[PDB]
PDB file of N, CA, C and O in Angstrom:
ATOM      1  N   UNK L   1     241.721  97.125  56.391  1.00 51.93           N
ATOM      2  CA  UNK L   1     241.498  96.616  55.049  1.00 51.93           C
ATOM      3  C   UNK L   1     242.599  95.634  54.645  1.00 51.93           C
ATOM      4  O   UNK L   1     242.968  94.755  55.424  1.00 51.93           O
ATOM      5  N   UNK L   2     243.093  95.814  53.429  1.00 53.47           N
ATOM      6  CA  UNK L   2     244.144  94.954  52.912  1.00 53.47           C
ATOM      7  C   UNK L   2     243.630  93.519  52.782  1.00 53.47           C
ATOM      8  O   UNK L   2     242.744  93.103  53.528  1.00 53.47           O
ATOM      9  N   UNK L   3     244.205  92.802  51.828  1.00 54.25           N
ATOM     10  CA  UNK L   3     243.815  91.423  51.589  1.00 54.25           C
ATOM     11  C   UNK L   3     242.350  91.361  51.152  1.00 54.25           C
ATOM     12  O   UNK L   3     241.637  92.362  51.216  1.00 54.25           O
ATOM     13  N   UNK L   4     241.944  90.176  50.721  1.00 56.38           N
ATOM     14  CA  UNK L   4     240.577  89.971  50.275  1.00 56.38           C
ATOM     15  C   UNK L   4     240.228  88.482  50.244  1.00 56.38           C
ATOM     16  O   UNK L   4     240.614  87.732  51.138  1.00 56.38           O
ATOM     17  N   UNK L   5     239.501  88.097  49.205  1.00 56.51           N
ATOM     18  CA  UNK L   5     239.095  86.711  49.045  1.00 56.51           C
ATOM     19  C   UNK L   5     238.292  86.546  47.754  1.00 56.51           C
ATOM     20  O   UNK L   5     237.063  86.521  47.782  1.00 56.51           O
ATOM     21  N   UNK L   6     239.020  86.437  46.652  1.00 56.70           N
ATOM     22  CA  UNK L   6     238.390  86.275  45.353  1.00 56.70           C
ATOM     23  C   UNK L   6     238.492  84.816  44.901  1.00 56.70           C
ATOM     24  O   UNK L   6     239.345  84.072  45.381  1.00 56.70           O
ATOM     25  N   UNK L   7     237.611  84.452  43.982  1.00 56.19           N
ATOM     26  CA  UNK L   7     237.590  83.097  43.459  1.00 56.19           C
ATOM     27  C   UNK L   7     237.428  82.076  44.587  1.00 56.19           C
ATOM     28  O   UNK L   7     237.571  82.416  45.761  1.00 56.19           O
ATOM     29  N   UNK L   8     237.133  80.846  44.193  1.00 53.84           N
ATOM     30  CA  UNK L   8     236.951  79.775  45.157  1.00 53.84           C
ATOM     31  C   UNK L   8     235.764  80.081  46.072  1.00 53.84           C
ATOM     32  O   UNK L   8     235.906  80.805  47.056  1.00 53.84           O
ATOM     33  N   UNK L   9     234.620  79.514  45.717  1.00 55.22           N
ATOM     34  CA  UNK L   9     233.411  79.717  46.495  1.00 55.22           C
ATOM     35  C   UNK L   9     232.775  78.361  46.807  1.00 55.22           C
ATOM     36  O   UNK L   9     232.331  77.657  45.901  1.00 55.22           O
ATOM     37  N   UNK L  10     232.754  78.035  48.091  1.00 52.88           N
ATOM     38  CA  UNK L  10     232.182  76.775  48.533  1.00 52.88           C
ATOM     39  C   UNK L  10     233.140  75.621  48.233  1.00 52.88           C
ATOM     40  O   UNK L  10     233.530  74.882  49.135  1.00 52.88           O
ATOM     41  N   UNK L  11     233.494  75.502  46.961  1.00 55.91           N
ATOM     42  CA  UNK L  11     234.400  74.452  46.531  1.00 55.91           C
ATOM     43  C   UNK L  11     233.794  73.077  46.821  1.00 55.91           C
ATOM     44  O   UNK L  11     233.580  72.720  47.978  1.00 55.91           O
ATOM     45  N   UNK L  12     233.533  72.343  45.749  1.00 55.82           N
ATOM     46  CA  UNK L  12     232.957  71.015  45.874  1.00 55.82           C
ATOM     47  C   UNK L  12     233.646  70.044  44.914  1.00 55.82           C
ATOM     48  O   UNK L  12     233.080  69.673  43.886  1.00 55.82           O
ATOM     49  N   UNK L  13     234.859  69.659  45.282  1.00 58.12           N
ATOM     50  CA  UNK L  13     235.632  68.738  44.467  1.00 58.12           C
ATOM     51  C   UNK L  13     236.974  68.434  45.137  1.00 58.12           C
ATOM     52  O   UNK L  13     237.518  69.272  45.853  1.00 58.12           O
ATOM     53  N   UNK L  14     237.482  67.200  44.872  1.00 57.37           N
ATOM     54  CA  UNK L  14     238.750  66.775  45.441  1.00 57.37           C
ATOM     55  C   UNK L  14     239.924  67.449  44.728  1.00 57.37           C
ATOM     56  O   UNK L  14     240.764  66.775  44.136  1.00 57.37           O
ATOM     57  N   UNK L  15     239.943  68.771  44.809  1.00 58.35           N
ATOM     58  CA  UNK L  15     241.001  69.543  44.179  1.00 58.35           C
ATOM     59  C   UNK L  15     240.439  70.445  43.078  1.00 58.35           C
ATOM     60  O   UNK L  15     239.345  70.204  42.570  1.00 58.35           O
ATOM     61  N   UNK L  16     241.215  71.465  42.740  1.00 58.55           N
ATOM     62  CA  UNK L  16     240.808  72.404  41.708  1.00 58.55           C
ATOM     63  C   UNK L  16     241.713  72.272  40.481  1.00 58.55           C
ATOM     64  O   UNK L  16     241.352  72.709  39.390  1.00 58.55           O
ATOM     65  N   UNK L  17     242.872  71.670  40.702  1.00 58.40           N
ATOM     66  CA  UNK L  17     243.832  71.475  39.629  1.00 58.40           C
ATOM     67  C   UNK L  17     243.205  70.598  38.543  1.00 58.40           C
ATOM     68  O   UNK L  17     243.262  70.933  37.360  1.00 58.40           O
ATOM     69  N   UNK L  18     242.622  69.493  38.983  1.00 56.25           N
ATOM     70  CA  UNK L  18     241.986  68.565  38.064  1.00 56.25           C
ATOM     71  C   UNK L  18     240.493  68.481  38.384  1.00 56.25           C
ATOM     72  O   UNK L  18     240.108  68.367  39.546  1.00 56.25           O
ATOM     73  N   UNK L  19     239.690  68.540  37.331  1.00 55.81           N
ATOM     74  CA  UNK L  19     238.247  68.471  37.486  1.00 55.81           C
ATOM     75  C   UNK L  19     237.835  67.040  37.837  1.00 55.81           C
ATOM     76  O   UNK L  19     238.477  66.082  37.406  1.00 55.81           O
ATOM     77  N   UNK L  20     236.769  66.939  38.617  1.00 54.27           N
ATOM     78  CA  UNK L  20     236.265  65.641  39.032  1.00 54.27           C
ATOM     79  C   UNK L  20     235.199  65.131  38.060  1.00 54.27           C
ATOM     80  O   UNK L  20     234.968  65.735  37.014  1.00 54.27           O
ATOM     81  N   UNK L  21     234.580  64.023  38.440  1.00 56.16           N
ATOM     82  CA  UNK L  21     233.545  63.424  37.614  1.00 56.16           C
ATOM     83  C   UNK L  21     232.542  62.675  38.494  1.00 56.16           C
ATOM     84  O   UNK L  21     232.924  62.050  39.482  1.00 56.16           O
ATOM     85  N   UNK L  22     231.279  62.763  38.104  1.00 54.73           N
ATOM     86  CA  UNK L  22     230.218  62.102  38.844  1.00 54.73           C
ATOM     87  C   UNK L  22     230.696  60.716  39.283  1.00 54.73           C
ATOM     88  O   UNK L  22     230.329  60.240  40.356  1.00 54.73           O
ATOM     89  N   UNK L  23     231.509  60.108  38.430  1.00 56.68           N
ATOM     90  CA  UNK L  23     232.041  58.786  38.715  1.00 56.68           C
ATOM     91  C   UNK L  23     233.220  58.915  39.683  1.00 56.68           C
ATOM     92  O   UNK L  23     233.224  58.298  40.747  1.00 56.68           O
ATOM     93  N   UNK L  24     234.192  59.719  39.277  1.00 54.69           N
ATOM     94  CA  UNK L  24     235.373  59.935  40.095  1.00 54.69           C
ATOM     95  C   UNK L  24     234.945  60.319  41.512  1.00 54.69           C
ATOM     96  O   UNK L  24     235.634  60.001  42.480  1.00 54.69           O
ATOM     97  N   UNK L  25     233.810  60.998  41.589  1.00 52.01           N
ATOM     98  CA  UNK L  25     233.281  61.429  42.872  1.00 52.01           C
ATOM     99  C   UNK L  25     232.976  60.201  43.731  1.00 52.01           C
ATOM    100  O   UNK L  25     233.488  60.072  44.841  1.00 52.01           O
ATOM    101  N   UNK L  26     232.140  59.329  43.185  1.00 56.51           N
ATOM    102  CA  UNK L  26     231.760  58.115  43.888  1.00 56.51           C
ATOM    103  C   UNK L  26     233.020  57.354  44.301  1.00 56.51           C
ATOM    104  O   UNK L  26     233.078  56.788  45.391  1.00 56.51           O
ATOM    105  N   UNK L  27     234.000  57.366  43.409  1.00 58.80           N
ATOM    106  CA  UNK L  27     235.256  56.683  43.668  1.00 58.80           C
ATOM    107  C   UNK L  27     235.905  57.277  44.920  1.00 58.80           C
ATOM    108  O   UNK L  27     236.492  56.552  45.722  1.00 58.80           O
ATOM    109  N   UNK L  28     235.779  58.590  45.049  1.00 59.60           N
ATOM    110  CA  UNK L  28     236.345  59.288  46.190  1.00 59.60           C
ATOM    111  C   UNK L  28     235.608  58.886  47.469  1.00 59.60           C
ATOM    112  O   UNK L  28     236.212  58.800  48.536  1.00 59.60           O
ATOM    113  N   UNK L  29     234.313  58.650  47.317  1.00 58.96           N
ATOM    114  CA  UNK L  29     233.487  58.258  48.448  1.00 58.96           C
ATOM    115  C   UNK L  29     233.894  56.880  48.972  1.00 58.96           C
ATOM    116  O   UNK L  29     233.659  56.561  50.137  1.00 58.96           O
ATOM    117  N   UNK L  30     234.497  56.099  48.088  1.00 59.59           N
ATOM    118  CA  UNK L  30     234.938  54.763  48.447  1.00 59.59           C
ATOM    119  C   UNK L  30     234.125  53.699  47.707  1.00 59.59           C
ATOM    120  O   UNK L  30     233.949  52.589  48.207  1.00 59.59           O
ATOM    121  N   UNK L  31     233.651  54.076  46.529  1.00 63.64           N
ATOM    122  CA  UNK L  31     232.861  53.168  45.716  1.00 63.64           C
ATOM    123  C   UNK L  31     233.642  52.717  44.480  1.00 63.64           C
ATOM    124  O   UNK L  31     234.420  53.487  43.918  1.00 63.64           O
ATOM    125  N   UNK L  32     233.401  51.439  44.081  1.00 63.06           N
ATOM    126  CA  UNK L  32     234.073  50.877  42.922  1.00 63.06           C
ATOM    127  C   UNK L  32     233.481  51.429  41.625  1.00 63.06           C
ATOM    128  O   UNK L  32     232.262  51.512  41.480  1.00 63.06           O
ATOM    129  N   UNK L  33     234.371  51.793  40.713  1.00 61.53           N
ATOM    130  CA  UNK L  33     233.952  52.334  39.432  1.00 61.53           C
ATOM    131  C   UNK L  33     232.740  51.567  38.902  1.00 61.53           C
ATOM    132  O   UNK L  33     231.802  52.166  38.377  1.00 61.53           O
ATOM    133  N   UNK L  34     232.798  50.253  39.057  1.00 62.83           N
ATOM    134  CA  UNK L  34     231.716  49.396  38.600  1.00 62.83           C
ATOM    135  C   UNK L  34     230.400  49.871  39.220  1.00 62.83           C
ATOM    136  O   UNK L  34     229.499  50.314  38.510  1.00 62.83           O
ATOM    137  N   UNK L  35     230.331  49.762  40.539  1.00 62.54           N
ATOM    138  CA  UNK L  35     229.139  50.174  41.262  1.00 62.54           C
ATOM    139  C   UNK L  35     228.619  51.505  40.713  1.00 62.54           C
ATOM    140  O   UNK L  35     227.468  51.597  40.287  1.00 62.54           O
ATOM    141  N   UNK L  36     229.491  52.501  40.741  1.00 63.64           N
ATOM    142  CA  UNK L  36     229.134  53.822  40.252  1.00 63.64           C
ATOM    143  C   UNK L  36     228.689  53.717  38.792  1.00 63.64           C
ATOM    144  O   UNK L  36     227.699  54.330  38.395  1.00 63.64           O
ATOM    145  N   UNK L  37     229.442  52.936  38.032  1.00 63.38           N
ATOM    146  CA  UNK L  37     229.138  52.742  36.624  1.00 63.38           C
ATOM    147  C   UNK L  37     227.713  52.213  36.457  1.00 63.38           C
ATOM    148  O   UNK L  37     226.864  52.879  35.866  1.00 63.38           O
ATOM    149  N   UNK L  38     227.493  51.019  36.987  1.00 63.91           N
ATOM    150  CA  UNK L  38     226.184  50.392  36.905  1.00 63.91           C
ATOM    151  C   UNK L  38     225.106  51.427  37.231  1.00 63.91           C
ATOM    152  O   UNK L  38     224.163  51.610  36.464  1.00 63.91           O
ATOM    153  N   UNK L  39     225.283  52.078  38.372  1.00 63.03           N
ATOM    154  CA  UNK L  39     224.336  53.091  38.811  1.00 63.03           C
ATOM    155  C   UNK L  39     224.260  54.199  37.759  1.00 63.03           C
ATOM    156  O   UNK L  39     223.204  54.431  37.171  1.00 63.03           O
ATOM    157  N   UNK L  40     225.392  54.856  37.555  1.00 66.81           N
ATOM    158  CA  UNK L  40     225.467  55.936  36.584  1.00 66.81           C
ATOM    159  C   UNK L  40     224.690  55.540  35.327  1.00 66.81           C
ATOM    160  O   UNK L  40     223.699  56.178  34.979  1.00 66.81           O
ATOM    161  N   UNK L  41     225.172  54.489  34.680  1.00 66.99           N
ATOM    162  CA  UNK L  41     224.535  54.000  33.469  1.00 66.99           C
ATOM    163  C   UNK L  41     223.018  53.997  33.661  1.00 66.99           C
ATOM    164  O   UNK L  41     222.299  54.719  32.971  1.00 66.99           O
ATOM    165  N   UNK L  42     222.574  53.175  34.600  1.00 63.68           N
ATOM    166  CA  UNK L  42     221.154  53.068  34.892  1.00 63.68           C
ATOM    167  C   UNK L  42     220.513  54.456  34.884  1.00 63.68           C
ATOM    168  O   UNK L  42     219.572  54.705  34.132  1.00 63.68           O
ATOM    169  N   UNK L  43     221.047  55.326  35.729  1.00 63.67           N
ATOM    170  CA  UNK L  43     220.538  56.683  35.829  1.00 63.67           C
ATOM    171  C   UNK L  43     221.295  57.609  34.874  1.00 63.67           C
ATOM    172  O   UNK L  43     221.492  58.786  35.171  1.00 63.67           O
ATOM    173  N   UNK L  44     221.700  57.041  33.748  1.00 65.15           N
ATOM    174  CA  UNK L  44     222.432  57.799  32.748  1.00 65.15           C
ATOM    175  C   UNK L  44     223.792  58.247  33.286  1.00 65.15           C
ATOM    176  O   UNK L  44     224.816  57.642  32.976  1.00 65.15           O
ATOM    177  N   UNK L  45     223.758  59.305  34.084  1.00 66.66           N
ATOM    178  CA  UNK L  45     224.976  59.841  34.668  1.00 66.66           C
ATOM    179  C   UNK L  45     224.915  61.368  34.758  1.00 66.66           C
ATOM    180  O   UNK L  45     225.747  62.061  34.173  1.00 66.66           O
ATOM    181  N   UNK L  46     223.922  61.847  35.493  1.00 65.08           N
ATOM    182  CA  UNK L  46     223.742  63.278  35.667  1.00 65.08           C
ATOM    183  C   UNK L  46     224.162  63.698  37.077  1.00 65.08           C
ATOM    184  O   UNK L  46     225.034  64.550  37.241  1.00 65.08           O
ATOM    185  N   UNK L  47     223.520  63.082  38.059  1.00 62.95           N
ATOM    186  CA  UNK L  47     223.816  63.382  39.449  1.00 62.95           C
ATOM    187  C   UNK L  47     224.362  62.135  40.150  1.00 62.95           C
ATOM    188  O   UNK L  47     224.028  61.013  39.774  1.00 62.95           O
ATOM    189  N   UNK L  48     225.191  62.375  41.155  1.00 60.07           N
ATOM    190  CA  UNK L  48     225.786  61.286  41.910  1.00 60.07           C
ATOM    191  C   UNK L  48     224.852  60.898  43.058  1.00 60.07           C
ATOM    192  O   UNK L  48     224.913  59.776  43.559  1.00 60.07           O
ATOM    193  N   UNK L  49     224.010  61.846  43.440  1.00 61.66           N
ATOM    194  CA  UNK L  49     223.065  61.617  44.519  1.00 61.66           C
ATOM    195  C   UNK L  49     222.015  60.587  44.096  1.00 61.66           C
ATOM    196  O   UNK L  49     221.719  59.656  44.843  1.00 61.66           O
ATOM    197  N   UNK L  50     221.482  60.790  42.901  1.00 60.67           N
ATOM    198  CA  UNK L  50     220.472  59.890  42.370  1.00 60.67           C
ATOM    199  C   UNK L  50     221.029  58.470  42.257  1.00 60.67           C
ATOM    200  O   UNK L  50     220.360  57.505  42.625  1.00 60.67           O
ATOM    201  N   UNK L  51     222.249  58.386  41.747  1.00 60.63           N
ATOM    202  CA  UNK L  51     222.905  57.099  41.582  1.00 60.63           C
ATOM    203  C   UNK L  51     222.962  56.383  42.933  1.00 60.63           C
ATOM    204  O   UNK L  51     222.628  55.203  43.029  1.00 60.63           O
ATOM    205  N   UNK L  52     223.386  57.127  43.943  1.00 59.84           N
ATOM    206  CA  UNK L  52     223.492  56.578  45.285  1.00 59.84           C
ATOM    207  C   UNK L  52     222.170  55.888  45.626  1.00 59.84           C
ATOM    208  O   UNK L  52     222.146  54.693  45.913  1.00 59.84           O
ATOM    209  N   UNK L  53     221.102  56.672  45.583  1.00 59.23           N
ATOM    210  CA  UNK L  53     219.780  56.150  45.884  1.00 59.23           C
ATOM    211  C   UNK L  53     219.580  54.823  45.151  1.00 59.23           C
ATOM    212  O   UNK L  53     219.068  53.862  45.726  1.00 59.23           O
ATOM    213  N   UNK L  54     219.993  54.810  43.893  1.00 61.25           N
ATOM    214  CA  UNK L  54     219.867  53.617  43.075  1.00 61.25           C
ATOM    215  C   UNK L  54     220.781  52.541  43.663  1.00 61.25           C
ATOM    216  O   UNK L  54     220.343  51.420  43.918  1.00 61.25           O
ATOM    217  N   UNK L  55     222.036  52.919  43.861  1.00 61.19           N
ATOM    218  CA  UNK L  55     223.015  52.000  44.415  1.00 61.19           C
ATOM    219  C   UNK L  55     222.383  51.224  45.572  1.00 61.19           C
ATOM    220  O   UNK L  55     222.162  50.019  45.467  1.00 61.19           O
ATOM    221  N   UNK L  56     222.111  51.947  46.648  1.00 62.49           N
ATOM    222  CA  UNK L  56     221.508  51.340  47.824  1.00 62.49           C
ATOM    223  C   UNK L  56     220.256  50.544  47.450  1.00 62.49           C
ATOM    224  O   UNK L  56     220.141  49.368  47.787  1.00 62.49           O
ATOM    225  N   UNK L  57     219.350  51.220  46.759  1.00 62.44           N
ATOM    226  CA  UNK L  57     218.110  50.591  46.336  1.00 62.44           C
ATOM    227  C   UNK L  57     218.413  49.315  45.549  1.00 62.44           C
ATOM    228  O   UNK L  57     219.150  49.349  44.565  1.00 62.44           O
ATOM    229  N   UNK L  58     217.829  48.220  46.012  1.00 60.90           N
ATOM    230  CA  UNK L  58     218.027  46.934  45.364  1.00 60.90           C
ATOM    231  C   UNK L  58     217.493  46.994  43.931  1.00 60.90           C
ATOM    232  O   UNK L  58     216.306  47.232  43.717  1.00 60.90           O
ATOM    233  N   UNK L  59     218.397  46.775  42.988  1.00 61.48           N
ATOM    234  CA  UNK L  59     218.031  46.801  41.581  1.00 61.48           C
ATOM    235  C   UNK L  59     218.100  45.389  40.996  1.00 61.48           C
ATOM    236  O   UNK L  59     219.067  44.665  41.226  1.00 61.48           O
ATOM    237  N   UNK L  60     217.061  45.040  40.252  1.00 61.49           N
ATOM    238  CA  UNK L  60     216.991  43.728  39.632  1.00 61.49           C
ATOM    239  C   UNK L  60     215.550  43.371  39.263  1.00 61.49           C
ATOM    240  O   UNK L  60     214.606  43.915  39.835  1.00 61.49           O
ATOM    241  N   UNK L  61     215.422  42.436  38.285  1.00 62.84           N
ATOM    242  CA  UNK L  61     214.111  42.000  37.832  1.00 62.84           C
ATOM    243  C   UNK L  61     213.460  41.068  38.856  1.00 62.84           C
ATOM    244  O   UNK L  61     213.985  39.994  39.144  1.00 62.84           O
ATOM    245  N   UNK L  62     212.326  41.513  39.376  1.00 64.28           N
ATOM    246  CA  UNK L  62     211.597  40.733  40.362  1.00 64.28           C
ATOM    247  C   UNK L  62     211.431  39.294  39.870  1.00 64.28           C
ATOM    248  O   UNK L  62     210.580  39.017  39.026  1.00 64.28           O
ATOM    249  N   UNK L  63     212.257  38.416  40.418  1.00 67.65           N
ATOM    250  CA  UNK L  63     212.213  37.012  40.046  1.00 67.65           C
ATOM    251  C   UNK L  63     211.253  36.256  40.967  1.00 67.65           C
ATOM    252  O   UNK L  63     211.545  36.060  42.146  1.00 67.65           O
ATOM    253  N   UNK L  64     210.128  35.854  40.396  1.00 70.04           N
ATOM    254  CA  UNK L  64     209.124  35.125  41.152  1.00 70.04           C
ATOM    255  C   UNK L  64     208.323  36.067  42.052  1.00 70.04           C
ATOM    256  O   UNK L  64     207.123  36.250  41.854  1.00 70.04           O
TER     257      UNK L  64
END
């Protein structure tokens, strides 16, 4: 016996001391706040996964 393992489950963030952000996350991935911003904004800012899809996905008004 002895010892255990409480708290900290899975852990999904660049540290526990400071909380992350859907944006800060993208920043960690290597994306510019802008990119994440534009995306976030577009997709409001709920999930970072959705934004990504948007990011990659060509966004713009079909010109011609």
